[PDB]
Design an enzyme around this catalytic site. Structure first.
Site, PDB file in Angstrom:
ATOM      1  N   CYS A 145       0.848  -1.183   0.000  1.00  0.00           N
ATOM      2  CA  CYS A 145       0.000   0.000   0.000  1.00  0.00           C
ATOM      3  C   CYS A 145       0.889   1.240   0.000  1.00  0.00           C
ATOM      4  O   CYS A 145       2.002   1.208   0.527  1.00  0.00           O
ATOM      5  CB  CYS A 145      -0.905  -0.016   1.235  1.00  0.00           C
ATOM      6  SG  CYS A 145      -1.727   1.540   1.622  1.00  0.00           S
ATOM      7  N   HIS A 146       0.405   2.326  -0.595  1.00  0.00           N
ATOM      8  CA  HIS A 146       1.197   3.548  -0.701  1.00  0.00           C
ATOM      9  C   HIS A 146       1.719   3.984   0.667  1.00  0.00           C
ATOM     10  O   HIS A 146       2.769   4.614   0.776  1.00  0.00           O
ATOM     11  CB  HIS A 146       0.371   4.678  -1.319  1.00  0.00           C
ATOM     12  CG  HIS A 146      -0.665   5.245  -0.397  1.00  0.00           C
ATOM     13  ND1 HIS A 146      -1.948   4.744  -0.318  1.00  0.00           N
ATOM     14  CD2 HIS A 146      -0.610   6.275   0.479  1.00  0.00           C
ATOM     15  CE1 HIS A 146      -2.636   5.440   0.569  1.00  0.00           C
ATOM     16  NE2 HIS A 146      -1.846   6.374   1.069  1.00  0.00           N
ATOM     17  N   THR A 147       0.973   3.643   1.711  1.00  0.00           N
ATOM     18  CA  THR A 147       1.337   4.028   3.069  1.00  0.00           C
ATOM     19  C   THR A 147       2.603   3.309   3.538  1.00  0.00           C
ATOM     20  O   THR A 147       3.441   3.906   4.211  1.00  0.00           O
ATOM     21  CB  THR A 147       0.170   3.777   4.047  1.00  0.00           C
ATOM     22  OG1 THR A 147      -0.932   4.623   3.694  1.00  0.00           O
ATOM     23  CG2 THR A 147       0.586   4.070   5.480  1.00  0.00           C
ATOM     24  N   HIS A 177       0.672  -4.009   5.938  1.00  0.00           N
ATOM     25  CA  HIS A 177      -0.563  -4.045   6.723  1.00  0.00           C
ATOM     26  C   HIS A 177      -1.775  -4.598   5.957  1.00  0.00           C
ATOM     27  O   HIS A 177      -2.868  -4.696   6.514  1.00  0.00           O
ATOM     28  CB  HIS A 177      -0.885  -2.657   7.296  1.00  0.00           C
ATOM     29  CG  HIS A 177      -1.021  -1.581   6.261  1.00  0.00           C
ATOM     30  ND1 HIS A 177       0.069  -1.012   5.637  1.00  0.00           N
ATOM     31  CD2 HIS A 177      -2.112  -0.959   5.764  1.00  0.00           C
ATOM     32  CE1 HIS A 177      -0.351  -0.091   4.788  1.00  0.00           C
ATOM     33  NE2 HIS A 177      -1.667  -0.034   4.844  1.00  0.00           N
ATOM     34  N   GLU A 178      -1.585  -4.961   4.691  1.00  0.00           N
ATOM     35  CA  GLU A 178      -2.628  -5.645   3.929  1.00  0.00           C
ATOM     36  C   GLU A 178      -2.248  -7.109   3.775  1.00  0.00           C
ATOM     37  O   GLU A 178      -1.268  -7.431   3.107  1.00  0.00           O
ATOM     38  CB  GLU A 178      -2.810  -5.014   2.548  1.00  0.00           C
ATOM     39  CG  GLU A 178      -3.351  -3.598   2.559  1.00  0.00           C
ATOM     40  CD  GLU A 178      -3.691  -3.105   1.160  1.00  0.00           C
ATOM     41  OE1 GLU A 178      -3.476  -3.867   0.194  1.00  0.00           O
ATOM     42  OE2 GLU A 178      -4.170  -1.959   1.023  1.00  0.00           O
ATOM     43  N   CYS A 209     -11.741  -2.228  19.850  1.00  0.00           N
ATOM     44  CA  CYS A 209     -11.719  -2.861  21.163  1.00  0.00           C
ATOM     45  C   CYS A 209     -13.126  -3.298  21.545  1.00  0.00           C
ATOM     46  O   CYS A 209     -13.312  -4.250  22.299  1.00  0.00           O
ATOM     47  CB  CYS A 209     -11.153  -1.907  22.219  1.00  0.00           C
ATOM     48  SG  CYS A 209     -12.319  -0.666  22.840  1.00  0.00           S
ATOM     49  N   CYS A 246     -14.997   0.865  24.169  1.00  0.00           N
ATOM     50  CA  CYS A 246     -14.717   2.271  24.473  1.00  0.00           C
ATOM     51  C   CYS A 246     -15.856   3.153  23.965  1.00  0.00           C
ATOM     52  O   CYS A 246     -16.786   2.659  23.331  1.00  0.00           O
ATOM     53  CB  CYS A 246     -13.397   2.710  23.841  1.00  0.00           C
ATOM     54  SG  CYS A 246     -13.483   2.882  22.047  1.00  0.00           S
ATOM     55  N   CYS A 288     -16.137   3.016  20.065  1.00  0.00           N
ATOM     56  CA  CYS A 288     -16.670   1.730  19.615  1.00  0.00           C
ATOM     57  C   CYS A 288     -18.161   1.574  19.918  1.00  0.00           C
ATOM     58  O   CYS A 288     -18.887   0.959  19.139  1.00  0.00           O
ATOM     59  CB  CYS A 288     -15.884   0.565  20.227  1.00  0.00           C
ATOM     60  SG  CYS A 288     -14.231   0.345  19.523  1.00  0.00           S
ATOM     61  N   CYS A 348     -11.495   3.878  17.504  1.00  0.00           N
ATOM     62  CA  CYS A 348     -11.289   3.258  18.812  1.00  0.00           C
ATOM     63  C   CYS A 348     -10.230   3.979  19.650  1.00  0.00           C
ATOM     64  O   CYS A 348      -9.125   4.241  19.182  1.00  0.00           O
ATOM     65  CB  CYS A 348     -10.889   1.793  18.616  1.00  0.00           C
ATOM     66  SG  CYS A 348     -10.540   0.883  20.119  1.00  0.00           S
ATOM     67  N   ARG A 406      -6.610   2.784  17.810  1.00  0.00           N
ATOM     68  CA  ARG A 406      -6.606   3.567  16.583  1.00  0.00           C
ATOM     69  C   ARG A 406      -5.192   3.695  16.028  1.00  0.00           C
ATOM     70  O   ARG A 406      -4.210   3.611  16.765  1.00  0.00           O
ATOM     71  CB  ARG A 406      -7.247   4.942  16.772  1.00  0.00           C
ATOM     72  CG  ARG A 406      -6.421   5.943  17.554  1.00  0.00           C
ATOM     73  CD  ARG A 406      -7.148   7.274  17.629  1.00  0.00           C
ATOM     74  NE  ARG A 406      -8.329   7.196  18.482  1.00  0.00           N
ATOM     75  CZ  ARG A 406      -9.097   8.235  18.796  1.00  0.00           C
ATOM     76  NH1 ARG A 406      -8.812   9.443  18.328  1.00  0.00           N
ATOM     77  NH2 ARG A 406     -10.151   8.065  19.581  1.00  0.00           N
ATOM     78  N   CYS A 410      -7.221  -2.753   3.786  1.00  0.00           N
ATOM     79  CA  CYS A 410      -6.921  -1.322   3.828  1.00  0.00           C
ATOM     80  C   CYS A 410      -7.501  -0.492   2.677  1.00  0.00           C
ATOM     81  O   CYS A 410      -8.594   0.057   2.793  1.00  0.00           O
ATOM     82  CB  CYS A 410      -5.414  -1.078   3.915  1.00  0.00           C
ATOM     83  SG  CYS A 410      -5.014   0.661   4.209  1.00  0.00           S
ATOM     84  N   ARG A 441      -2.919  -3.236  -7.196  1.00  0.00           N
ATOM     85  CA  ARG A 441      -2.397  -4.051  -6.107  1.00  0.00           C
ATOM     86  C   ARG A 441      -1.547  -5.207  -6.627  1.00  0.00           C
ATOM     87  O   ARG A 441      -1.894  -5.867  -7.607  1.00  0.00           O
ATOM     88  CB  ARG A 441      -3.527  -4.594  -5.228  1.00  0.00           C
ATOM     89  CG  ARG A 441      -4.013  -3.615  -4.178  1.00  0.00           C
ATOM     90  CD  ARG A 441      -2.906  -3.329  -3.181  1.00  0.00           C
ATOM     91  NE  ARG A 441      -3.297  -2.361  -2.163  1.00  0.00           N
ATOM     92  CZ  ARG A 441      -3.162  -1.044  -2.283  1.00  0.00           C
ATOM     93  NH1 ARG A 441      -2.663  -0.510  -3.389  1.00  0.00           N
ATOM     94  NH2 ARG A 441      -3.541  -0.253  -1.291  1.00  0.00           N
TER      95      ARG A 441
END
Ligand SMILES: [Zn+2]
Ligand SMILES: [Zn+2]
Ligand SMILES: [Zn+2]
Ligand SMILES: [Zn+2]
Lengths: 375, 375
Positions: free
Chosen positions: A43-45, A65-66, A95, A98, A101, A109, A113, A173, A368
């Site tokens: 991902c670009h992130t 993260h994907e 979670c 909270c 949530c 969250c 988060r 994501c 992707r």
């Protein structure tokens, strides 16, 4: 549960190629789960923090993260997951107890988060990854560029075990961020017009969402014209390159649509694009949605009358999807053939050639790229 | 139908006291109606253009747009109104057949929307008022500071003939602008907190709306502390004067409410206030509503993350009420005892002492002053 020795793609230094290393992955602590990663994508992130473009740089680090994978073990207190479960790690968690949530409106969250600076786990502030007794840092609490990773359970979405992990890994994501930005926040009615700024995975998810919602006109805006042709497969009806026009792009869009589009979605994070995305919607009923995250600190600016003329501006995070509650539902949307994921996948490589995925993204060649573990 | 000779309060020159003159009021042309004004009141907007503060100044002129009266005659093509009907003139209209009128979302009629520069009628561009053969110009197509006025029928709301015109005349602008800003646009749920910037008629209408909606906490923000005590009658639970705090007021509000209010409504038109009103709402579910119209051209500015943290900013015009369709309903809300108007009325004067209403407003002493014709 004991310590695992496995392969991970480690970034030792900003902007340098990842190196496949043998790393050690500690067992999961309270509320943590340890996952065998089968498929992951870029991902670009990941790229942004790997280049160490803006943020506080942290190295060495395992990005990613994907992903789609299978639970190998769980720590104490984990009841909603067990070994063998098919899961998607998510960069931000739920979670479930909270204030945020409990709310119907928000997915931010207070416990889980997104945090881009954090290199260790919540429980103890430490990394579960090491090489020769030295820490390799986490990324977004997911670090999926490893054959095995450790993740807080609130960030682990159990999904349909029949869903193919090498397809639905992209749901964790980019695609879902755009899809939800449209379906949950913009909420275009049947027949309406939509403008989408940015034609990466987020934008194409947003377009796909507009198609699913029955938008009659979907206008894609991107500076790279070579992204245009493929965009039609995602429901985009025409594309516009701001560079081909002397007029400001919001004026161009407004002239195309007799006053402006009904909905817009800004997916690049460019502040100037946020401003244009807002101003290009129609007065009276126009709604603009921001979801792209900015790299600069420039302010959003606009003449107040643009608002008083009955426009609305909405910001969203992760498409307003609740990671554990909603994302499994998104996978079903694909199982039940509403959502078409295959067209998002333009490349595939083995984990041993993971750096190729970086090449394809930096050249603007991919949407992707699926990375496959064990080869 | 012929020409009427009557009294009107004429402004010959910016910022100078109005002069009661004998004027001539021509008969209504196509789609126009001629109205006998029984009660009218003063709005900050009348004063702003009377001082010729910002806009292109136009004199001589008959101001006034909040009033209650009775139809004296109608021009050709008028079917929804007849002589004897009780009516409220509105500063902005509803043709009922344009794209904006057909929409469920917007009240910005393409035919009849507010125009502050126009001194004549739509039909022919001329004024129906004259003195010694010279034009006296209209204001907002209403000009209610006259015993008789001529108004486009789309700007004339027929109301319940039993409703007391000396109370419901204030429903035609300020009060309804605020009331609707809250009830139609902000849409606070029972138990929520609301911040209201500005404690004039618009603000107090907004507060009244929040009370009606069952808000549990309503925080009034105004620079004039002497407006605070009376505000409690309108549902305001506490007031804050930004001048008494070193911290920015949005920070003060956010600390009062554990992250910010659920809803805000900006009623002063100050750009800085628009910025504060947006930033003082809670992340995740906060919604800010702008309704106050600015006198300067300064841009709305804010850090984009304030949006991406799931805030929403909405602009509205006239509380999103449709003049002919909705305003009669607002009068009923008062007839049926949901809406309490009496507390908005702090002063009363005869038409012969109309300039007193200007005094009370310029001294910050009044909410609404009722002006009574025929004395
Ligand atoms: Zn939570
Ligand atoms: Zn991502
Ligand atoms: Zn209309
Ligand atoms: Zn007014």
């Amino acid at each position: 549960s004991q310590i695992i020795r496995c392969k991970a793609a480690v970034a030792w230094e900003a902007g340098k190629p990842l190196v496949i290393e043998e790393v050690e992955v500690a067992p999961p602590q309270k509320h943590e789960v340890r996952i065998k990663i089968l498929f992951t994508s870029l991902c670009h992130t990941d790229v942004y923090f790997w280049e160490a473009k803006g943020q506080t740089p942290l190295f060495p680090r395992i990005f990613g993260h994907e992903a789609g994978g299978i639970v190998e073990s769980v720590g104490e207190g984990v009841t909603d997951l067990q070994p063998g479960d098919h899961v998607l790690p998510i960069f931000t968690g739920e979670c479930g107890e909270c204030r945020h949530c409990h709310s119907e409106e928000s997915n931010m969250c207070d416990l889980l988060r997104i945090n881009t600076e954090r290199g260790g786990m919540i429980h103890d502030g430490e990394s579960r990854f090491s090489i020769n007794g030295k820490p390799i840092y986490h990324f977004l609490g997911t670090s999926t560029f490893s054959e095995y990773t450790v993740v807080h359970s609130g960030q682990v979405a159990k999904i349909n075990p029949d869903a193919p992990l090498d397809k639905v890994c992209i749901v964790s994501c980019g695609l879902s961020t755009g899809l939800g930005a449209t379906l949950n926040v913009a909420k275009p009615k049947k027949g309406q017009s939509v403008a989408i700024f940015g034609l990466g995975a987020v934008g194409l998810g947003a377009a796909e969402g507009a198609r699913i919602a029955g938008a009659s006109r979907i206008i894609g805006v991107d500076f790279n014209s070579k992204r245009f042709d493929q965009a039609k497969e995602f429901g985009v009806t025409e594309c516009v390159n701001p560079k081909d026009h002397d007029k400001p792009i919001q004026q161009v869009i407004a002239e195309m649509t007799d006053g402006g589009v009904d909905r817009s979605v800004e997916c690049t994070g460019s502040v100037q694009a946020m401003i244009q995305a807002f101003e290009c919607v129609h007065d009276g009923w126009g709604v603009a949605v921001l979801v792209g995250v900015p790299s600069k600190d420039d302010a959003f600016k606009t003449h107040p009358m643009n608002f008083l003329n009955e426009r609305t501006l909405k910001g969203t995070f992760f498409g307003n999807y609740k990671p554990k509650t909603d994302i499994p539902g998104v996978v079903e949307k694909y199982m039940n053939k509403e959502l078409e994921l295959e067209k998002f996948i333009t490349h595939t490589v083995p984990f041993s050639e993971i750096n190729k995925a970086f090449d394809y993204m930096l050249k603007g060649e991919s949407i992707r790229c699926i990375i496959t573990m064990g080869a």
